[PDB]
Ligand binder design. Sequence first.
Ligand SMILES: [Mg+2]
Ligand SMILES: [Mg+2]
Ligand SMILES: [Mg+2]
Ligand SMILES: [Mg+2]
Ligand SMILES: [Mg+2]
Ligand SMILES: [Mg+2]
Ligand SMILES: [Mg+2]
Ligand SMILES: [Mg+2]
Ligand SMILES: [Mg+2]
Lengths: 215, 50, 68, 113, 177, 202, 132
Amino acid sequence: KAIAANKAARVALKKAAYARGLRYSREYRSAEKKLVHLRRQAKSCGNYYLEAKPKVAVVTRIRGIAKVAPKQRKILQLLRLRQIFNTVFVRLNKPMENMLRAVEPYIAYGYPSLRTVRMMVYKRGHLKINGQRVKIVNNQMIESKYNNENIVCAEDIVNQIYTGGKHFREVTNGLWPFKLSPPAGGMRQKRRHFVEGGDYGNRDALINRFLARMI
Amino acid sequence: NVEPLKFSVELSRNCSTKTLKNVLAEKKILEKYAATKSARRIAAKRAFAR
Amino acid sequence: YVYHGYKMKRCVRWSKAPARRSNTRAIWGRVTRPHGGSGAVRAKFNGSAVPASAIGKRVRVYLYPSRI
Amino acid sequence: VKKRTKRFTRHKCELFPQLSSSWRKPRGEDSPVRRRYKGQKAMPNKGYGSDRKTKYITPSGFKNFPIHNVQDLYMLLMQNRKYAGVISHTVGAKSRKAIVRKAHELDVRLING
Amino acid sequence: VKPHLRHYCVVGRETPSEKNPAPTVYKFEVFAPNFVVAKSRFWRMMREKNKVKSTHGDVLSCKVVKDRKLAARNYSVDIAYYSQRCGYTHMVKEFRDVSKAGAVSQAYHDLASRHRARYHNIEVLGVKSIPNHQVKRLSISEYHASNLSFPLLHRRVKAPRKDRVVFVKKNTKRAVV
Amino acid sequence: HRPEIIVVDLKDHVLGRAAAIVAKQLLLGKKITAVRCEQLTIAGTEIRNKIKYLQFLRKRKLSNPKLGPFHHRSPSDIFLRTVRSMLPRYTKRGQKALRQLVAYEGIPTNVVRTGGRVVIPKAQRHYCYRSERPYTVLGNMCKHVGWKYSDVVKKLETARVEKAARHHKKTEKLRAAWKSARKEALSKVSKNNLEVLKKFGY
Amino acid sequence: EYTTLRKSCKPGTIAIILAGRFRGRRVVILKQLPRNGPLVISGPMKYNGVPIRRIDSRYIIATSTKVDIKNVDVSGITPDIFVSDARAQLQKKVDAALIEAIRKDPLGKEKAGYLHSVFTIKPGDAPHRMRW
RNA sequence: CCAAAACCAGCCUCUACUGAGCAAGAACGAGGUCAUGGUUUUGGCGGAAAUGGGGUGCCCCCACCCGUCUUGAAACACGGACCAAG
RNA sequence: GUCAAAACUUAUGGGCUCACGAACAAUGGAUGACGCUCAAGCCCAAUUAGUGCCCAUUAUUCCUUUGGUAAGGGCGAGAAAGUGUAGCCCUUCCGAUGUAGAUGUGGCGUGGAGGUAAGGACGAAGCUGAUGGCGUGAGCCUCAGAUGGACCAGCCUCUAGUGCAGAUCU
RNA sequence: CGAAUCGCCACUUCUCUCGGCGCCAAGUACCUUCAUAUUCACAAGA
Ligand SMILES: [Mg+2]
Ligand SMILES: [Mg+2]
Ligand SMILES: [Mg+2]
Ligand SMILES: [Mg+2]
Ligand SMILES: [Mg+2]
Ligand SMILES: [Mg+2]
Ligand SMILES: [Mg+2]
Ligand SMILES: [Mg+2]
Ligand SMILES: [Mg+2]
């Protein structure tokens, strides 16, 4: 009886995950075509388009845990950047932009592409479950973690940690911070800022490349 | 990176390309070049490797 | 890495092929990946290391398993 | 397939005939071995623990179980594919005749039969 | 190699406020490795000139600028730079190159060697293409003549890498490696 | 029986590049035989390099020079020392590799007429020096530093050359035959082969 | 049937033996065995002296050169087969078919001679730079 | 027991926008691999073989005498020839 | 560049340089050595080229161990309601360095005792050991003595004059 | 005494600024031996 009701649910969930990610695919294709029209409108209008600011950065701890000061050392813990190539998505509040500004030599970050978000959540994605670090494998796994009619798909997660979400904290917090491998082909200098020809600090959209070699 | 060849069409600097598909055609500096053993040797090794 | 001991020992066809009983011995490996941007490659010889005496010496890298 | 096959010998047992090879944890700030410099001897630790379902298993594949007399053999009658009796060193060659022609009749293995 | 420095034009403004309801937009040509540095150098000038800062502004366009063509030409790069040894040398060197980006990056390597000057000490002040004659500098003037021929003297011709060799027979090109 | 030796001809090679490339091949098991070490070049005027060597020669154990650093003056012994400084000279792997190298001043009669002589293009003088910069030919500096056989070798080098050249026109009729014999071989029955030879450039 | 045997190795293709008793021998690939099994290359023994026999695909270098030997009936090559009269008879029946299949081709005279060829990694030779 | 090949899984590697470029997205195809999992196959070896251990040597590599007080010990700082019993 | 893994001395990059050049006065001799000079130097940029590679006790992943006073499931031979053992079984997760020090340990080991169980003249203890085997380890066990000659291991409980390379220790 | 090694040559083996050949018929004609050595395994052969 329950044995099959587990089927009615597992079938109903992909019916939902299908329905969800069909919307998210449309909500991407549409949102970006709309964001192309405007910047394209404006070029016709001899006119600039102030693109909406990033509302999510994929912060990545990039120096190791030795010799770090008590203020940086706390901010990294609150970012949950406790190891080297840990990663988290943190949305760019002023209060966060002032946390990130406090530990930039310890982190590389930028504004993840939707693809960067997919790869981390699908490949490197791990839910916290009963404190266990649990590899994402089922959408069943996700709906149980997130008791939230909003958050069912792994596509629900990627939208939250990309669109900026109303559950961006509800989602990203239920994820273990990402444990990325060191960037293939290496860094540049974990000591200099990115614009110095180094590695640390905000590197805008370029983080997707750097973070792609890692994932 | 380049090795000058004994061939050289007379020409003017910054000359347009269609001018060149012209002038070299009026000499066949290229068709003349492949005739040389220096050229054949290059296409010869390029046939053995191929 | 073909070399030899100082006594004969069982070889791959010691009984089927008496002709093949040398005190010649061989240690097999696989090329594992290219090493450096030059022509060098990494060979793990089975689970074991190849002996340090092998160094400077004729390894013979066979054309098989073939791909091509 | 064991982690480490070597003994964890005491540091500098080789220089001092009196020292047993048996392990003592090194002490002294300046001990090269407890400061664990790379060229030095290793120390035992939890990480060298053997795999736990192959543990205690002799290459015969049996776990040895001590045996002293013919009655012990029946302690191994029903688990004769798991335990192998190792007859105690001090049972007489007399009694071992009896353990052995009985450890044969029962299909129980013996390490030193 | 292709130029060291891409040609960006970063456009941006101090973000709107009741203090400044309709702020000036600022175009700013930069020669940067990549936009994140071009965006950076752009905010360097915004505070060093407009007193606006990166927190308070917003780049409106990071886009790279298309090359004029590919014909060999002639560039007057105007390059201020800094050192402890020299605190601000205005200096219009001219360079001969195919592109503004190429003349400029060429001006950084030139400037980094004759002056131990890092990228961020330097700031380009403009990169006009110049006509033949305007170039006062005598070095590139040698290359103007429509009739210029020179030998490629005393070449080192390394083999294509696939063909390179450690040992070769002496009056032959049999390999021996 | 001879082993798979390769007799590098060291004339007009940079000392330390040739010494570095050779020192590596000895490790990879090549049994090299350097020759014409008299002809190795070094960057700079001879005076630059005599002073470098005389600062070398200046180094000896005061306690007992007899066991001190030894300052060999043969260009070949100088090349062996240069090449042992570039290999693990205390491990047997390198002590071995150094004995697989045989330097000679000039090219000795045992080593001549033995096979073609190799060259190290990465260590060529023209490949390395800026052509108009001054350079020190090695056997020339070391003549001023104590090598006594600099003219013994030149007398020998003169002899192998005049001798090798006499044999080069002793055989001119012979080489000319195969040139003629081989050109008329194309005209022979090799018909379809003549087209497979045209492709590939033969 | 199932076969992952690679596209480069197809029946009737010439194929260098890289290993085993018949190193360097060009050998036509007569057939692949009924399951994803080892190829049955044949010399023909009339040429290079290679008997009908099995070889793993990993131990040959399938040359681009081949022969349109669909005409030949290699059906008598079955796994159950794997010098006795029944087998000596089998190749004789086959090599003569296989050998004529080689004859039908234009440039079929070289391929007879091409199969008399023996491969050898001569010094200075770079197979990895080779194409086949 | 040693090998080798295969299969499956795993795993890994190898358009869009823009004005030719990117801050840009997948696909096809192929390879690698058991110090990955499961599926055998096929050969080699079989008084000996085989794996493991042990011993001795070598090779390449790594490696500062320990205890000690001390900020700091390889210290040109102290204690230290060997072993047994205590 | 060699030593030295990697540019088998890569660049189809720019400059600069002839004599030195490569983060924190006296034993001869130190860019680490050699050597390098169209660099093997310096500034700059690069990554196969106007169409990279090498090396960590690091990261990631896999296997194993151990710990968790961590999360769950379960109760041919096994399936014990269990802190801890040769762990009741399986699953997943996170941790692991460490002086002084603290603590744990069905942790090791010694002489003795209350018990239990057993062994020994067909050879106890002791000792010897290319005797292997087991255990992370302290150690245990077996084999062999061409050693010995009569005592004694296991297990639970009790006990202590209980574990030694170092005291200029006796 | 079983060995590891695996191109040769008086067409390179001078000098000073595509060497020839060899790779399975002593030749381009495939005459013609090869198996069971039974699909890798030191080439079992020099
Ligand atoms: Mg770095
Ligand atoms: Mg620092
Ligand atoms: Mg003091
Ligand atoms: Mg190296
Ligand atoms: Mg600890
Ligand atoms: Mg007592
Ligand atoms: Mg002993
Ligand atoms: Mg006491
Ligand atoms: Mg052999």
